[PDB]
Amino acid sequence: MTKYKYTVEESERFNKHGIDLTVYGQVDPSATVVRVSVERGHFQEFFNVRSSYTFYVVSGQGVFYLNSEAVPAGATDLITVPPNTRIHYFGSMEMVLTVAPAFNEQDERHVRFISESESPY
Ligand SMILES: O=c1ccn([C@@H]2O[C@H](CO)[C@@H](O)[C@H]2O)c(=O)[nH]1
């Protein structure tokens, strides 16, 4: 009766500002978990007024810019970002991302675009 398991095959996969997102389709008010694949960066800076962003780095290396502060990241690191924190990032990475409470695009605010030449990856 209840669906517990979601697959990549049945997910929604799309590119957003340079990252490849896998949105599984599960609904849970407390958290959204998605996959992120990034080749060079997320070339837009935004913040979320309601939800924290927690990135687990499966593989690769990158750098997060959190309120303009560089935060290096490598495989097996956990990057935790509170609400109301400006976020962009560069890197070649595979990640698991938790947005808590559940992701709602209406909670996010655009700050600026980032030139693709700014990524050192
Ligand atoms: O469920 C989610 C989680 C994150 N993002 C996007 O992922 C990027 C940050 O990794 C941002 O563009 C953010 O809006 C989504 O589109 N949906």
Author numbering: 1 to 121
Structure paper excerpt:
In pacidamycin 3, biosynthesis the 3′‐deoxy moiety is mediated by Pac13, an enzyme found to catalyze the key dehydration of uridine‐5′‐aldehyde 1 to form 3′‐deoxy‐3′,4′‐didehydrouridine‐5′‐aldehyde 2. In stark contrast to most characterised dehydratases, Pac13 is small (121 aa), monomeric, co‐factor independent and utilises a non‐activated nucleoside, rather than a free monosaccharide, as a substrate. Pac13 is the only monomeric, metal‐free cupin dehydratase characterised to date. We demonstrate here that the reaction most likely proceeds via an E1Cb mechanism, with H42 acting as an active site base, however, unlike many other dehydratases, no metal or cofactor is required for activity.
Mutants E108Q, K16R, H42Q, Y55F and Y89F were produced and purified, affording diffracting crystals of the same morphology and space group as wt Pac13, which raised our confidence that the mutants folded correctly and that the effects seen are specific to interactions with each mutated residue rather than global effects on protein folding and structure. The kinetic measurements for the activity of Y55F and K16R demonstrated lower affinity and catalytic efficiency than wt Pac13. Finally, the significant loss of activity with mutants Y89F and Y55F is consistent with their proposed involvement in stabilizing the oxyanion and underlines their important role for catalysis. Similarly, on examining the Y89F–uridine complex and Y55F–uridine complex structures, we observed a high degree of similarity with the wt enzyme. Although there are subtle shifts in the position of both the ribose and uracil rings, of the substrate, and in the orientation of the 5′ functionality, these changes are small and consistent with our hypothesis that decreased catalytic efficiency of these mutants is largely due to inability of the phenyl mutants to stabilize the transient 5′ oxo‐anion that forms during catalysis, rather than having a major effect on binding competency.
